[model samples]
Target chain A: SKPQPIAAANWKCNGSQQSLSELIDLFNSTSINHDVQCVVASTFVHLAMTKERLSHPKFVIAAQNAIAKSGAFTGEVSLPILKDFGVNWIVLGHSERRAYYGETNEIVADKVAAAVASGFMVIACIGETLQERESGRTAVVVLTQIAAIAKKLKKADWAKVVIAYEPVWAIGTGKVATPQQAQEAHALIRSWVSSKIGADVAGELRILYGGSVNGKNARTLYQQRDVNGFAVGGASLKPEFVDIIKATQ
Target chain B: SKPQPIAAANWKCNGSQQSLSELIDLFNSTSINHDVQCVVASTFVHLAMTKERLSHPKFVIAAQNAIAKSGAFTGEVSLPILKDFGVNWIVLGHSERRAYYGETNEIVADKVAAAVASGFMVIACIGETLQERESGRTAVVVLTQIAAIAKKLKKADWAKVVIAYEPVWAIGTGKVATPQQAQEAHALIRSWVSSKIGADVAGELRILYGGSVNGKNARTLYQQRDVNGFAVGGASLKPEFVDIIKATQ
Candidate 1:
């Protein structure tokens, strides 16, 4: 129970009332690993409905992104407000947020701090672009992103944080990191944390591999020692998501 | 009823379930002008409950912001999803969104067009910064902002659009535009619409003033011929919001 394998689904900008009801019905009936923790990071519009539907202990709800401060950031959901709505987890620094909305490393760090301060679990995401990976700066890019968060967090915060390494190019592009590729990136992340923190802490941190992870490759990715679990996207909306939840079984 | 006065509350990044319940109770008990339209533009998290509470003909619910497109824009609420939730109005391009979230005139124009195309009413916002106002470029700044939206709109689209002029400096700063200032900005916006579309269309467009608008000054602001009503903020969360809604009566 030190570090549970997590299947965090980033629903992104998708879903309707009908789809929501359907997914909820599907999830509530499906059985999965009691050991692999499941969390759905839904769009803010769906969070209210997501909360209403999630009745089982097998699943929890997460906000896709959160504003670090509490006031006047229009169109930004704050941690306090999310907490009021029963949100227990927040996916910070998502690749989509960083790419499209200018969520710089510093901003993501601020949100991570805020989420931790509010006592909510955080799936802090980091990644390299195709260019960065091609240029062989994957490790540098990932570490820099993690370092921003690392400096802000206290030693105790590591227990509540899960690092999601989602390569930007692979996201929604149908391209996935090979199990070898995923293990390499994930191992590097664990080493970076181990160097900064300690072996015991690094061993306990949950590092999830994301970017086009699906039922097909979930087992391979989960089999990697460094890849504790996944931060899934597209496949999460469908019934197949249940299979991903049960992949570890 | 050519251009019905509108009292719109943009509850920018604020509210809790308890507060929402309280406001709903207050709205149900309070009465306002049937001729003057009233709407509350709540955070996306609160829209569902807002729609459920606003059953009277005098009030409707609106979203603070929405993505122009329907897919892949993470953490975004699309107009179609809002419509499905019975939200007919969306507040596009609030100064807060423009200032903090990079909602340029061009981006907002796309949203305005999308909202109109999807048969949803839009409270399209436009305004000038403190520097622009101090530099005597208030009219130019507002006209430029309006021009971006004007070029994208069809003549008939004006029927479903309300222009909200909220100066960036005055928003949430406790500094309000004088009645004369409000009229001047509103007049410029109306005339610009007249020149771009047609006199009849311009005459039929409701131009609302926003920026620290409170109950005490609502009547004065509404008294201006060009100031059809208000896109109110802080006061919108309080009991006084009803007073602002009834200001014209």
Candidate 2:
């Protein structure tokens, strides 16, 4: 069976009500590639509006983040809150949170387990910074990050998970992994899962390429056997995201 | 002239779409006392939902938390995002964030400055933990917290700010500051602001009493000369909150 590519958008602290109409219309009108799972992570505020206006059958809305636990954690949106908002998908462990905020590996693992246990779909992100990559620690760094999640997941939890591999060095820095670089990491992650978590789950897992992804580079990147899809950033906010979606086919 | 009292509801990590409609109706139907500036902080996902249905002229919506800077901070709700959703109030420096999330006094100051600079109203919260209070560090702990924000505030920014002195030991723990205890902290904070920031600014300042505030105790707490308002936690979700509002009168 072919992997169903995921073209997920991470809006990352952007958009307004006045400007969201056109983007909603953009998603509403496009006949999304059925083989692709097109997920959009809008700002938490606009999600209700996006959920109502978005009509594409293959499309679903995601929360950019979710609190690892329920009540008493102020300033955090929890899984139940997103559940109430008609959102089933959550993106966790983004590099921005890892770098700027103090989200450690254990904390991210807690968030992923909580979301999956509550029956929510998760795009669990794992990436290595420039220092780690330059120090020849990419494999150990990413593998350690994945192992943390693996320890927390139940056997059935694998079905609801999507692993996004975003390199911190390239995120919002205008640099990107070359096609070979992305394929290697994806292969490494999938192979590690196949060996440890079971081959069947690894085979079905979607390892998305993230960081500075755009329409021009998507088709070429999508050709790699292991580049299952993408978790796009800036281009995800534009009509060009549709072009990136089409490139997957 | 008397300070305009504020009765704020911090629906921390709580509520859903189905439940919110009833609460919205609750706020709408209440003939709120003219003097109390009533405010509500809903979960981030519900601000748009809360803003549209809530119509009391004295009422305004608040975001429980907001990111300090604008774009590229993934999984965070920003000030501009809140502004677009018709939200003008932001609750900063809650004890939960200070204890769990690594929002230090410095980070809280940054968020306070950014929110005020963007022309948004901020309920800048400050308080000492149970241990800090037990060790006789209450004044030192809270004044240090206020000083951080004072250095960041422009001379004119004081008008848009409201200080919420919530004792960490009392918040969500069923332990509350006695009326006398509440007055002492509130009066200490106000006097410090007056001496340091200017008496004119302090005269108009509203120092809110947070932590275990409910219908039963609100009236007595409101009787203190310095207990100008409250930041209700668990009780904010119920009809009893209206009774708490009435008590402020």
Local accuracy of candidate 1 as per-residue lDDT tens digits, B145-174: 989998899899988988999999989899
**What is the DockQ (computed on Cα atoms) for candidate 2?**
0.85
True contacts kept of each: 0.65, 0.91
Docking quality level of the chain pair in candidate 1:
medium
For all the predictions, what are the DockQ values?
0.73, 0.85
State how far residue B162 of model 1 sits from its true place (Å): 0.5
Using lDDT as the measure, the top candidate is 2
Q: Which 10-residue span in candidate 2 chain B carries the lowest summed lDDT? A: B67-76
Residue pairs whose backbone atoms clash in candidate 1: none
Clashing pairs in 2: none
Q: Which ten residues in a row have the lowest lDDT in candidate 2 chain A?
A: A168-177
TM-scores computed on chain B for all candidates: 0.96, 0.97
> How high is the lDDT of residue A115 in model 1?
91
